[model samples]
Target: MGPGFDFAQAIMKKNTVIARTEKGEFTMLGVYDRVAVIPTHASVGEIIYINDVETRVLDACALRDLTDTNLEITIVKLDRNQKFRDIRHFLPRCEDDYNDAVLSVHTSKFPNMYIPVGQVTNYGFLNLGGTPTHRILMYNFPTRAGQCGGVVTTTGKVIGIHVGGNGAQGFAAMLLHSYFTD
Candidate 1:
């Protein structure tokens, strides 16, 4: 309703925020009221935004093997009335069954959008961070570079958070509970 305000752009901001880095901007997913997740490779000092509201990045976890496995949980400070729909409730307590069907929802380079459906090729993947430090989920489908911050869901439940991927391999972190803080 104001000058330079696009109604469609305003609606999109409510659904997904932008992670503006020195290089460019990327999309991030909100997992809780004031908690969100983004790829670790995006670098620190990158400011995030949900419309005009600037969401601060609480922390960024740079695990071992930056190319293979990486994810970080960020906390935001929003007004009492600016509630963010938490998506963690839909995630399973543990990783989903192996070879289970899964899908990711995020913006893609292609105009069609919606990455191909992939299944849980494996779970409990270990990175240089050591065994207990981080747990990664493996899937057979490929995703775009900027899709790491998206959520991977199945059977109406989120099993992992897409981190990174290669030609035909996809990786997602499964330790959402550990990263959560009050």
Candidate 2:
């Protein structure tokens, strides 16, 4: 009697029948059916179905003040179960345009960690239902040489991405936990 108590009684049946009669002959056919929709990762026809309920959305921003700003980013990989690490000084800049700004971790002594700015849809400064005190710009693109790979965070979620910054300062972007349905 939990959540499925009335499931069985809710089951309904649909039926379709076809009949034909020919010179001195008669034929009849009938069909009954039940159908349910299921979600999957596999592609069906030209459409691919995904289990959106299990998917997560992330909020991310760029490390540069302007979009398309080029800066060397370092990629970093954390130790097993480790969350934080010291970011190195030198970062590699990608020459090509990326859908999102890549947070470099390599030059920072970390590995494989990257934050994408172009992917950011929610800027913490906006009037979203999140704490205002926590709002802060993740990165500052300095006009002088040397700036890239900033930190990012989520407005409501816990996970965040780090980019680059001068001593005592760093850039960041937010990562959303779920995908948008609309």
C-alpha local distance difference test of each model: 0.51, 0.22
Instruction: Report how far residue 102 has shifted in candidate 1, in Å.
Output: 4.1
Clashing pairs in 1: none
In model 2, how many backbone clashes occur?
49
Off by over 4 Å in 2: 1-104, 107-158, 179-182
Candidate 1 per-residue C-alpha lDDT over 1-182 given as tens digits, one digit per residue, 9 for 90 to 100: 22112322332345355555554444555666755555555554645544435556555545443455434433444332455566555556654554444433435342213443556754655452233324677777766566655555554455565666665777776644545555
- Tell me how candidate 2 scores on lDDT: 0.22
On a 0 to 100 scale, what is the lDDT of residue 107 in model 2? 22
What are the runs in model 1 whose C-alpha is more than 4 Å off?
Answer: 1-15, 51-81, 98-102, 108-112, 126-133
Residue-by-residue lDDT tens digits, candidate 2, 124-156: 332112312122234333311122222222221
Give the Cα-based TM-score of candidate 1 against the true structure: 0.64
